[PDB]
Design a binder for this molecule. Structure first.
Ligand SMILES: *Cc1c(COP(=O)(O)O)cnc(C)c1O
Ligand SMILES: *Cc1c(COP(=O)(O)O)cnc(C)c1O
Lengths: 396, 396
């Protein structure tokens, strides 16, 4: 039965971990997956989290089945983080959140839903975009197309190509955006550009689909959401797939949410009923651990205080590594100008390296980056900064 | 976009818990969801588990993503559980396991796989069977045919019918089997019957898919594995979806696995690489908490010796509840003869109640049972045994 199966090609992102986790070279450098690292070079369990985790221990009396849509405070907390502690969607009971296995569980369930209970046929992902976006949407059945985004020559958002491209979109089509910290470009639209698009959408009849993974890594928790909230005020319906993987450092405990907004309480209610039906024949219900962690903190004033300190420390570090990168790079006499790198935001950097360069970097020097030239600034350390910069300059 | 979606019908199983909670009848009893209860009517968290959890608290240093397929001890330990310590599948390296969210997640990753990489067109699920089986398979896109199992009047396994119905099963079809504790009948085939069914499939050309979720609730860890192992001995290709939800009291953690066996180490390895691509476009990688726990309980001698006693207690307690139930039923005036109930295995008994009786019990008396007449014995306690038997009795 399986004699004919064919091997699948390594995950461009995930796979790198293996290759890296196998070369027995003293000073290698993994700059591949998007996980935060500290000055010493490791992803520590955040402190607020360890705290929540003790509380769980001491206070948990049961492991009984969560509902299909998980814990309800988790859902509730998620919505204010998204929309506002005030907002209308909350206030008229327009949204319904389902706890899910990370951002990817959210993306996928939105896809099972759309594909089975609506009339969507295509989805519009940017160019570039996270490699797995395509895989997921295709699994559900939907056809993906691409819109124009980045201007590789200038290192800016090519708005007018972005717009024209989309003009190929049809009313009733899905158009996925990244709420902030564009991946892999790190270039986000401006609040006016967000408003514009928000309006255009509304006229062309598009169904917005936000992929929100880095809330708090660009400017702040609340201001990171302006685009999303810009759309929220104009739209009648929208789905949102958030993730607390990168902002709570809960990577492995798989924590995120799928937020369904619709015209009115009765409507979203009816739509949610199927969305559950879709969770039911996938993973059944959600894993408690992380969503319990997250909730505990989000509902405790002290804990939340500590957690919000941790986040800004992460953010700030990275901001330091990006200045220190172009600098050393400069002092190591790199050919080109790498100044744009300072202008991008989030963990990564769209380096500008070609396929062969990034390949060589690896064999030659054991410095791991994604094929596309996507580098992980958060894996950069003052201690690995010099050798890394030598590698880079030498293949350039 | 969403204005026409219709409301989905409630889960027959997971849907009861809604109503039960939402019910205000003081003396209500709940016999719905297959969740274990203790003398006091609480689903507690195992000692060994709590113990394992302390450890993780003190010893865990990172949240960094696990791999697509999870934690390697985990898969290692589960293959020993399944096939036995010195197994040949283990020695010839024919198996490959992936950590999944729950057993359902196991089920679904198998369907997604088979459907996308093989030429499977349909699967054969028992009659009756767990009601979610159909839905997961339909989601993958497969077609579900029913075989003949249970013999209503005699409350016995109808081998003849089983055998002749399966006779419509093409070579290349999938045939789901319940390793032990047949949900919802509690009737399992004998070791010979297992042996007979193992030959036909081999003769017939089917792919076995095993739902293994109650390992240890029938006779014992190893004893419960016999049928599987009987099948593993002659099969070149197999699939096993096992769960850690019942025997570890980890319900909301989502622990399970999808074990892929093949002909040789190179074939299985190839086939798995596709499986790993299926997982990737679904939830991405699995939840570390609950798999960690299990991996710890099974790898540490003491922690394991304890766990094994906990399971023994669960199993027996239920056994004690079956005898009491038919008993009380009898000297409380039961028309029918319910003793067949003593000869079933696991948490449930297939009462033989009419949809209308179950509907009534619920409405008149406050007693929650699935609409097929499936009752959760494990939820039965000596302090509820009486009002329960009285309710039933009045509807007969
Ligand atoms: C990491 C990432 C995801 C996946 O989120 P997980 O919670 O890790 O599954 C989705 N989208 C973007 C843009 C990401 O960076
Ligand atoms: C409980 C059960 C399942 C669901 O298992 P989870 O680990 O809860 O996802 C699947 N199949 C059968 C036969 C079950 O009894």
């Amino acid at each position: 039965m399986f004699e004919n199966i064919t091997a699948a090609p390594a995950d461009p992102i995930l796979g790198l971990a293996d290759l890296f986790r196998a070369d027995e070279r003293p000073g290698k450098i993994n700059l591949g997956i998007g996980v935060y690292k500290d000055e010493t070079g490791k992803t520590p369990v955040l402190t607020s989290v360890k705290k929540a985790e003790q509380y769980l221990l001491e206070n948990e009396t049961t492991k009984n089945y969560l509902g299909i849509d998980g814990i309800p405070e988790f859902g509730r907390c998620t919505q204010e983080l998204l929309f506002g502690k005030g907002s209308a969607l909350i206030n008229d009971k327009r949204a319904r959140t389902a706890q899910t296995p990370g951002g990817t569980g959210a993306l996928r369930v939105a896809a099972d839903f759309l594909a089975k209970n609506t009339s969507v046929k295509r989805v519009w992902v940017s160019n570039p975009s996270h490699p797995n976006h395509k895989s997921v949407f295709n699994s559900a059945g939907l056809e993906v197309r691409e819109y124009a985004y980045y201007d590789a020559e200038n290192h800016t958002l090519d708005f007018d190509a972005l717009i024209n491209s989309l003009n190929e979109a049809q009313a009733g089509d899905v158009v996925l955006f990244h709420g902030c910290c564009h991946n892999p470009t790190g270039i986000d639209p401006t609040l006016e550009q967000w408003q514009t698009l928000a309006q255009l959408s509304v006229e062309k009849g598009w169904l917005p689909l936000f992929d929100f993974a880095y809330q708090g890594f660009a400017r702040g928790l609340e201001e990171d959401a302006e685009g999303l909230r810009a759309f929220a005020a104009m739209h009648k319906e929208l789905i949102v797939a958030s993730s607390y993987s990168k902002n709570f450092g809960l990577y492995n405990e798989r924590v995120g949410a799928c937020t369904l907004v619709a015209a009115d309480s009765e409507t979203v209610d009816r739509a949610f009923s199927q969305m559950k039906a879709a969770i039911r024949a996938n993973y059944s219900n959600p894993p408690a651990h992380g969503a319990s962690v997250v909730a505990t903190i989000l509902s405790n004033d002290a804990l939340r205080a500590i957690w919000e300190q941790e986040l800004t420390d992460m953010r700030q570090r990275i901001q330091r590594m990006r200045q220190l990168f172009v600098n050393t790079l400069q002092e190591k006499g790199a050919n080109r100008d790498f100044s744009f790198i300072i202008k991008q935001n989030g963990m990564f950097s769209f380096s500008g390296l070609t396929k062969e360069q990034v390949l060589r970097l690896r064999e030659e020097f054991g410095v791991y980056a994604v094929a596309s030239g996507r580098v992980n600034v958060a894996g950069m350390t003052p201690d690995n900064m010099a050798p890394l910069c030598e590698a880079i300059v030498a293949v350039l």
